[PDB]
């Protein structure tokens, strides 16, 4: 049971039903979850480089000592949780014995990449927000909305037996608690062969001799991913669509376009940054998923049931040390749409 | 409840019933024997999965 009033956002023409209702009491109850911690004061760029006053500093080498300490303290406040410095550090602070140390090194690289390359298309839609460690982790070692491959895609299939739901027909937040395919996050936010443009076009709306569409199962998977998108942003389908015409981008609110990039960005995050971490993890780590996979990034990982992560708090100027240099060959169409050039390993 | 059929009517019904039941039964036994000789229905302790016996290039739906 919910209750009026609601924060309403009319995302389309009047009378079309294109609007989003957001519960103010629910956002108030999730205020602790949806607000980043108070930022530390800005650190000066003048001083000895962190790679000179510390033995094993590579990713943050170009940082000043003060900026280094600021970002280290913030990362402790964002990912370490109640473990503090020991979360990633042994007694020796220059030793990468814990997988958390090296994973956090790759995570600093990934956050820099995201703030340098995905800000123009996705991470600064409303505010110059970008992402920090807290955007996904929310103060915890494991991002609460990190996802693993479902414990049905990795299991051995009893092909002639009973009870195979085909990654559907089960309760899952990954599909916004629909019976839609639960491996849609793997299909689209990791895999690149998945087709999200499932709505038929034809010619004149007709299955012309040249008309080839997607299967109904592909429609199931895409609608499941879209359920995940709606769940993650705490909005309905109308946030990014006149549902009457899903294929029509001209009839869709601007948030669809950025959502598109988010899809690709998630793929980027999962393909070039999250999955290659499996080497760093221990073979029998309890953090790994049932299929022995590292938790991937979905829409919900940053949009923890929120339209814009951390209430769109600005971090690009606030944490320049988490903003890297733009990738010279960055292209949002090279993540499974115009090609797979920027998805390393696939 | 009583069907009202006489003993002779019940006996001709049962003659036909025995004919149909046992003819279908024998035909089905022959059919199952033929299908069993074609491929025994029940696997041995080794099983009869292709993955356990066929080379790797023999695709198995299992």
């Amino acid at each position: 049971c919910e209750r009026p009033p609601f924060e309403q956002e009319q995302t389309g023409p009047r009378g079309t039903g294109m609007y989003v209702l957001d519960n103010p009491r629910i956002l108030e109850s999730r205020l602790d979850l949806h607000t980043a911690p108070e930022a530390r004061p800005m650190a000066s760029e003048d001083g000895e480089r962190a790679g000179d006053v510390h033995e094993n500093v590579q990713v943050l080498a170009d940082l000043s000592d003060e900026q280094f300490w600021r970002i280290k303290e913030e990362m402790t406040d964002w990912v370490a949780g109640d473990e503090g410095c020991t979360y990633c550090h042994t007694d020796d602070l220059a030793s990468d014995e814990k997988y958390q140390y090296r994973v956090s090194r790759d995570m600093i690289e990934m956050t820099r990449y995201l703030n340098a390359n995905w800000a123009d298309t996705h991470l600064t839609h409303s505010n110059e927000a970008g992402v920090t460690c807290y955007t996904c982790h929310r103060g915890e070692p494991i991002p609460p909305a990190s996802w693993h491959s479902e414990e049905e895609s990795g299991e051995t299939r009893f092909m002639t037996g009973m009870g195979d739901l085909q990654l559907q027909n089960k309760i899952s937040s990954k599909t916004a608690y629909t019976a839609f395919p639960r491996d849609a996050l793997d299909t689209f936010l990791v895999g690149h062969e998945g087709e999200l443009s499932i709505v038929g076009e034809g010619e004149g709306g007709l299955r012309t001799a040249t008309t080839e569409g997607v299967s109904l199962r592909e429609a199931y998977e895409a609608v499941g991913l879209m359920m995940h998108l709606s769940y993650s942003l705490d909005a309905g389908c109308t946030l990014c669509h006149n549902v009457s015409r899903w294929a029509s981008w001209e009839d869709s609110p601007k948030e669809r376009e950025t959502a598109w990039h988010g899809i690709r960005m998630a793929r980027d995050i999962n393909v070039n940054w999250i999955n290659p971490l499996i080497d760093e993890y221990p073979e029998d780590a309890d953090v790994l998923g049932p299929t022995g996979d590292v938790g991937k990034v979905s829409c919900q990982t940053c949009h923890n049931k929120e339209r814009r992560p951390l209430y769109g708090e600005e971090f690009l100027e606030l944490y320049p040390e988490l903003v890297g240099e733009p990738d010279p060959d960055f292209d949002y169409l090279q993540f499974g749409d115009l090609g797979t050039d920027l998805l390393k390993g696939v | 409840i009583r069907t009202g059929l006489t003993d002779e009517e019940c006996q001709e019904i049962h003659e036909m019933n025995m004919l149909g039941m046992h003819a279908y039964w024998s035909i089905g036994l022959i059919a199952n024997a033929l299908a069993y000789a074609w491929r025994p229905f029940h696997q041995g302790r080794a099983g009869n999965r292709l993955e356990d016996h066929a080379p790797d290039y023999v695709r198995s739906a299992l």
């Binding site: 034809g202 010619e203 004149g204 709306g205 007709l206 299955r207 012309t208 001799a209 | -």
Partner: protein, 268 residues
């Protein structure tokens, strides 16, 4: 206006062509249903209250009035709908009313007492004057004094002897017996003795439990006095469809004519 092989050309596609075919079938189906509608009351008759004569060709023929349908009945009779006895009954129906105005569509105000006029809500159709039987030739609508096998269920009030009150609360009578439908297993009528016996249709009777714990029948349609004018049964122990129809029509007459007010609006 491209060709869309094999799905058509321009808008001449098979989405729209199955649409057109189904609308053609739906139009034919509506025409068929309208013809079936015209099996009663058709051919239409113009309003006799008219300063002009009747046009030679009458309304209600765009879907043609179909050939009369033949029904074979259990009693061996072959009836033809529209049943001409009903049509002649309507033709020769005593009105006891005059049009309010000289134009067609004018309502009929009854000349005298509208309870006895059998006009409007008191109007009734011509029906069979032989009592209807069940499939086993048993009297279909029968009092429980004859059909002793039928009983009021334990959880429900047995109103034999219960008071029957009229619109104004006056004592119309007492329930002598309950008439049930053998086929429907429902109460059709309450036989109400008046201190002579009349019948009270079950839908015209409200079995109300008084706060005394005493059950009574409240009859909103007619008053206690008007119970004396309910059409009687030709045979006390059986009712024909015609008598059922007369009694129900009398109570329907009461629904509009029992008291002077109920035929008048809130604000005229």
């Amino acid at each position: 206006m491209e060709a869309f092989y094999p799905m058509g050309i321009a808008r001449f596609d098979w989405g729209i062509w199955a649409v057109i075919f189904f609308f053609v079938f739906l139009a034919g189906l509506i025409v068929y249903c309208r013809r079936e509608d015209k099996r009663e009351g058709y051919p239409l008759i113009s309003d006799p209250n008219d300063k002009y004569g009747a046009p030679r060709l009458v309304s209600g023929t765009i879907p043609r009035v179909p050939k009369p349908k033949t029904f074979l009945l259990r009693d061996g009779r072959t009836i033809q709908v529209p049943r001409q006895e009903k049509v002649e009954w309507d033709r020769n129906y005593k009105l006891e009313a005059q049009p309010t105005a000289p134009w067609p569509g004018s309502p009929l105000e009854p000349i005298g007492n509208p309870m006895k006029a059998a006009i409007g809500p008191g109007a009734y159709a011509k029906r069979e004057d032989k009592p209807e039987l069940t499939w086993h030739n048993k009297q279909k609508i029968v009092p429980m004094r004859i059909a002793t096998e039928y009983y009021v269920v334990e959880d429900d009030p047995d109103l034999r002897g219960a008071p029957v009150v009229g619109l104004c609360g006056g004592q119309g009578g007492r329930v002598r017996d309950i008439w049930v439908d053998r086929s429907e297993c429902r109460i059709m009528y309450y036989e109400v003795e008046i201190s002579d016996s009349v019948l009270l249709p079950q839908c015209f009777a409200r079995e109300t439990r008084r706060m005394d714990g005493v059950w009574e029948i409240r009859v909103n349609s007619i008053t206690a006095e008007q119970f004396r004018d309910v059409p009687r049964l030709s045979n006390p122990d059986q009712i024909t469809p015609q008598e059922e129809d007369m009694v129900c029509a009398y109570y329907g007459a009461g629904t509009l004519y029992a008291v002077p007010g109920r035929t008048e609006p809130f604000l005229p």
